[PDB]
Design goal:
The PDB classes it as viral protein. The structure holds 3 chains of a larger assembly. Chain A is mainly beta and 616 residues long. The first copy, chain A, has 10 helices and 31 strands. Chain A has 5 domains: 1-58, no CATH class; 62-109 and 165-223 and 282-334 and 383-407, Distorted Sandwich (Adenovirus Type 2 Hexon, domain 4); 126-151 and 335-378 and 470-514, no CATH class; 225-241 and 261-277, no CATH class; 409-467 and 517-616, Adenovirus Type 2 Hexon, domain 4. Chains A and B meet through α1, β14, β21, α7 and β22 of A and α1, α2, β1, β3 and β7 of B.
């Protein structure tokens, strides 16, 4: 390998090595001519035209150091559903990133009871005890007698008695640290300098937490992380779990049989994910510790705020705490409704009834439904045991401090501007009344009001979703077949003395959350001129987040998270585009919906990140 | 305390004594020169030191951007045709481009239940419209083996041979990437840059990091996994097992191996489901894709001046793939049930249909999803809409005339593709497509069977760069039954104590096992070894791991290889290349343990080259 | 206006243009049009295809064998760094371990009896029973060995274990990795450093390559058959879409599926999965030195050939390769027989009404079947990126750069038995950017830990929680065609519970509750919960250079603003680092659970040319 540095027009345009050699020849000639001791050029001489890919240079930084400080609230002992205020203490010359430690006590539901059994299903042979409800359907035409049985059991199968003791489990809503803070306000002189709601926090959750930060984020805000679990070998090369009668069969013409398993060719095991954190129902949710970070522009160290610039007299962080009934929820515990259907096929007298004779075919179907206990609810006395605000304080030399205060003048900042418009219309043009500055981009969703309804038993999960979520069962079913001869003098093949039994039992059940999009098209108009034409929803949810922002902008998992973009580099401090303030006044977001109507009201959530300034 | 000066280390890193000397100096000068405020500027400070707190930014020359969509000039779009778009006149510059493709809802044509398979056993053969039955006697063992096959639906209902049955339909695994057979950007009828689907899958493997992946999938029609939670599988302090087996101890008090104990955590299982375009469905709903055009000017810095490429002769030209390479037939609600029953009788005629005293009965059952006969894709499926979206950029008239006058030229990156079919285990392949400096090359050896119509897995293998075989993974439901048929005989030890067992296929998984087609790669140019003969994993794993930062993904595909010649692949600033001279006589040598005459493979080679584009 | 004036300052720009064109016209330039550099003195151009030419440079990799002869486990291997390029940069080690199997062994002896009655011992099964004449339940215990197909294995017959590699074997094989210069370690690190990198510095756009480089298996996505088919159901008709006598849908009666869906599962079949034969393992273990950065490649003339070496100490095979249960399983069967007539609850009781079977399978080691100690290190080679520059620039660079800033590892591991302690960091004597911290239980690396192959790199106490997939089964059969079955004891009951699969959940118990950091009478970090160092700090700092770790015990004590960048951005001063205390709280570590406090610091040093 030799390094060729001048090979035609392409190398002269990319490396320009002959101009570089002419610069070096010429620069050594002048250094010598002028009386310099060392004629060889300086590294910045070369870097006037060329870039050095091998370069160890760095700049010394003006001396600095930082330290975190904890602070308790001014507002007494913390509770749910209250406003908590923090003073920004006088410590560092600057303060930067902030995070709040939240501690919620271990908690359990109150003792309740087993509820009443369901109603009868069949019209005949109805018996209701304290442990089961039995009914039947007769069918004297076919000879099939169908017997329904429902009962309450625990996980081990032991039947529970109606009105006996039973306790529900408890669980947290998904991303509890994000729902806990209804509003977060940075306060100076009584006036909000910036504030955001849980709506802005979940938008951050959907758009700005890439994978290399995701496990820490979920742990910071109390969301359970899946744990990987490995099975036994399911495949062992050169063998099979199947009984040999069905293994490696060939038909009478020598063709390998379709549906006949053959030995495995690899040795493998299965991976499955389990969760057992705050969102998983438990008899006792243990103490929940969260570190909810505050999503203000000055998290950036370059944008730390001068302590002398904001009077200690009234600089506050203020956090409105959510109600407990929106954070902690009941859910079925160790109690399951067992539904059982049995079919009896008789041929003799009384066939199709409880008195039929000669039973040829028995079938059984059994599902299990996790059931809530009655009178068992969340402990309304659950203590908020601790809440403390952490502030990164930054310190600089007195010389640099003086120069810095006297010379920057102003700093560019980003603020949140929210608006929530209730909608029953399949199409509307909503004036964006709350927008008043240059807007870089707008988070946009159309969240169905039902996602936050107390009557929605999936509110713990649906609350941060921006679509309509329907719940889709996927059943794991175990299938049995059993055959038995009851006459030891008669060949069973072809005989009714060769009985038949089969059963289908629910092994498990998953719930698939199917998202239904609420937005079809979105149009952005200002003074009657289109900022965005009427484009399909997937353009703002998939394309714009894919194309712009690099590792600062995440293509969101939520099918309802839309990104109205107006700059070229949405993540970066350096400005790169916005919508002017005269247009920011008369600003319309027009949507079309296949979902929203009077029967399904929705909230059009628009959250804008706007450019503002701070003088010192 | 901020320390700022601990000996050698702190001067080299922070140089604070120097900084304070500079401050004293500047303050004395500005006073002596007659400045009223002698405090240094922030600019003075930064000539030697970096300020870790600095809100400085630069104002940007005013610019905005807005998208505009246009319809093709070539009439109504269809499969297997050429679509051409004009790049309309609108902005001073045009940049990122995406194309909305809208394929209609579709479903397969009505077919019939196929014929039953051939007999398996030689004895007792009976063929009926609903089942095929054959047997194998064994009068030595007493085991009578009965084979029965039939067609059923998901509910298990028998289906008559030649009865109506309809296949499901699915899209291939990245329909947006396969659909655009070729994508050209023509100026004056000549291709300035063009790429094929092979370039798109290379982008899919190397340049879609996970924080862009979900959106990327939704843009090009790849279904996205949905997380699904199950009921509780572990409840702390209890167990699903029956109590006779729980927490056993042997005669010596030691806990029994294989005896379950109560759980110690409360947990549920997470599982992923898909139900999008690649899942077989009765109806595949309307497919709306937004396929990004992977040209260099997608970078906003590198937008194309509209004055430089005149309207009326600039075009985006897309060649559309055939429908049969995009939309596919799959089994629907029809399954081959393959049942094997073994009857162990011990009385007279044992091992025969006339055996008397049945002791043990075993049943084994698999289900195989089966295609219906004469049920294929709807060839009339319409391309309902295709539209090119171009981001237009507007700048001030003042900067526009300045920029076009002074910028001179712009760097561009072009695709240079060569495909060579091979039947050799080893070979030297001249790269006749390389005319310009080469930055890096995407390399794969894709078996021809991956894109062949006879491969029933083409819908999935088409983008893979290895040989892919299908290993089954079975979930089996094992049952046992035991029944005494005589109430006067003690069951234990009595042939009246029957035995019955069944093995039922609960589900089946297909594991795609990758067999690598490349063993080593050597790169040789003008008689110079650029890369010595190295194992493939050096190019697939180490080079993508070490280079490119978040611009280079370590590919999942075991056959995706990255030949690198620059230090920062993905950046605009050039960082190394292969000169034109060596690019003009460039050989890729490979060795392969797979490619022979029975397994032809395509040595796909796609280079990214540096070229230049002049103004105006 | 007002807001745009400060962001774009277009009025000032238009005047600078108008101003510049006037001056150039006065001074007699042919072209009054301003330069782009003129514009960039005040404004930034968002559309700009400018670039600088780079001083010519190419690179090539070179491959070298050791100086120490043929490689073996548990030895020291040294590579020279040959004279080739003007600079050398990133380094990677190709390791090739031969295909291997366990030795032939035997089916172990069967378990002891369980019940006190009716004990029977053959070479294929153990049987024992527990009577109950009060209830009439006769319980029958059966244990035996089978293979995966269920064929009964005979005691003392042949059986071979399987072989598996420990997790991340490329990170454990390199016990010590070392860049020696003029006889002295310039930088060195152990496997503890490498696993910290595994936890903090491998983002997921690099993760599949990283795992393939160091011998960690990659999960493979696998799709199933349709489990939901819209407008139909797997359930048989009698239980679908039921309504009660009031017209209300029955709770627990399945309905037709609304979507068509299929499952995705993940499987592994790489070096961590037990196999009859592990095929030859090929790893490319990257060497994690500071000079992997091309900007910081070491100049050849400054550290010439002959006084520069890479020295690697190889782990013992016993901590890399492990035996595992192969195709051998302990089947544990319990059968209950409820009889009501004479002799009820014993083996002679008549009138059997209810049968139940419960069956689990436990993978079982074979006796006398161990790993192959002859297993060869078949090849080991060091790859070095060499960089070439023109003679003119190289002469200038070697005369002008002066020095380069470097980063080096400083490790201390102190065994602890205290629930709380304040531990002096004796290994820090240079500025400190950040420290990786963990309290690893000593049993995670213990040979007596069957799960050592998995726990060795974990920084918490890992416990194993089983998760079972149980197949439930029911059977009824009428044994008298002249008696109506409903309500009759001639209508028999039968049920079985068979283990379909078992998963093992690694539950991590944290060993660190709080961490406080002191240095020379200064609190650098007040006593905070571990989750502040594990979760908040890696989340807020480092951008794509700092991954929030999955290991619940990995902590990041940060002392800089931009960890992972070359430009310095904060450090613990030399005076404080020289008297440095890390105080911890533990709810796990005590006399019975020894733990190792692992502190690995990244320190700043400098290198002269």
């Amino acid at each position: 390998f030799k390094l060729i540095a001048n090979d035609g027009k392409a190398d002269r345009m990319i490396m320009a090595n002959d101009l570089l050699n002419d610069r070096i020849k010429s620069i050594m000639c002048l250094r010598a001519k002028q009386g310099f001791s060392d004629p060889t050029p300086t590294l910045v001489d070369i870097e006037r035209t060329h870039i050095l890919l091998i370069n160890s240079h760095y700049k010394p930084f003006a001396a600095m150091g930082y330290e975190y400080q904890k602070t308790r609230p001014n507002t007494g002992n913390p509770t749910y559903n209250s406003t908590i205020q923090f003073s920004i203490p006088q410590f560092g010359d600057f303060f930067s990133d902030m995070v709040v430690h939240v501690q919620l006590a271990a908690t359990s539901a109150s003792a309740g009871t087993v509820p009443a059994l369901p109603a009868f299903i069949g019209a005949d042979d109805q018996v209701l005890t304290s442990t089961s409800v039995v009914s039947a359907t007769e069918n004297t035409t076919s000879g099939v007698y169908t017997l329904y049985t429902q009962s309450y059991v625990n996980q081990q199968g032991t039947t529970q008695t109606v009105a006996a003791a039973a306790t529900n489990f408890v669980r947290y809503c998904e991303y509890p640290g994000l729902r806990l803070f209804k509003r977060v306000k940075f306060e100076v002189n009584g006036n909000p300098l910036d504030e955001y709601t849980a709506l802005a926090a979940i938008m951050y959750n959907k758009f700005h937490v890439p994978d290399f930060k995701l496990t820490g984020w979920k742990r910071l805000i109390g969301q359970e992380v899946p744990v990987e679990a490995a099975s036994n070998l399911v495949n062992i090369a050169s063998t099979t779990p199947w009984g040999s009668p069905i293994v490696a069969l060939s038909d009478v013409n020598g063709t390998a049989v379709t549906g006949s398993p053959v030995n495995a060719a690899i040795t493998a095991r299965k991976l499955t994910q389990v969760v057992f954190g705050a969102q998983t129902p438990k008899a006792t949710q243990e103490q929940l510790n969260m570190f909810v970070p505050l999503l203000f522009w000055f998290r950036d160290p370059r944008l730390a705020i001068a302590s002398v610039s904001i009077p200690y007299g009234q600089r506050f962080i203020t956090v409105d705490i959510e109600q407990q009934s929106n954070i902690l929820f009941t859910a079925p515990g160790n109690l399951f409704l067992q539904t059982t259907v049995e079919t009896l096929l008789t041929t003799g007298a009384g066939k199709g009834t409880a008195t039929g004779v000669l039973l040829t075919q028995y079938n059984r179907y059994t599902t299990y439904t996790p059931t809530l206990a009655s009178g068992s609810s969340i402990d309304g006395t659950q203590a908020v045991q601790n809440i403390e605000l952490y502030i990164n304080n930054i310190f600089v030399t007195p010389e640099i401090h003086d120069i810095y205060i006297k010379r920057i003048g102003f700093t560019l900042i980003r603020v949140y501007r929210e608006q929530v418009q209730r909608e029953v219309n399949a199409a509307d043009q909503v004036l964006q009344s709350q927008l008043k500055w240059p807007v870089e981009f707008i988070y946009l969703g159309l969240r169905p009001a039902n996602n936050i309804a107390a009557g929605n038993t999936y509110q713990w999960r649906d609350w941060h979703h921006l679509t309509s979520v329907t719940n889709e069962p996927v059943y794991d079913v175990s299938q049995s077949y059993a055959r038995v001869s009851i006459d030891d003098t008669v060949a069973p093949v072809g005989s009714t003395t060769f009985k038949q039994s089969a059963s289908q039992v629910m092994q498990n059940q998953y719930i698939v959350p199917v998202e239904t999009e609420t937005l079809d098209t979105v149009r952005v108009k200002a003074h009657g001129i289109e900022l965005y034409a009427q484009y399909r929803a997937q353009f703002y949810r998939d394309y714009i987040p894919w194309n712009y922002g690099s590792f600062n902008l995440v293509t969101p998992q939520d099918k309802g998270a839309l990104f109205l973009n107006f700059c070229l580099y949405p993540g970066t401090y350096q400005p790169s585009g916005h919508v002017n303030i005269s247009r920011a006044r008369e600003f319309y977001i027009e949507y079309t919906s296949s979902f929203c109507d009077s029967s399904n009201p929705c909230d059009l959530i628009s959250i804008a990140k706007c450019i503002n300034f701070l003088l010192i």
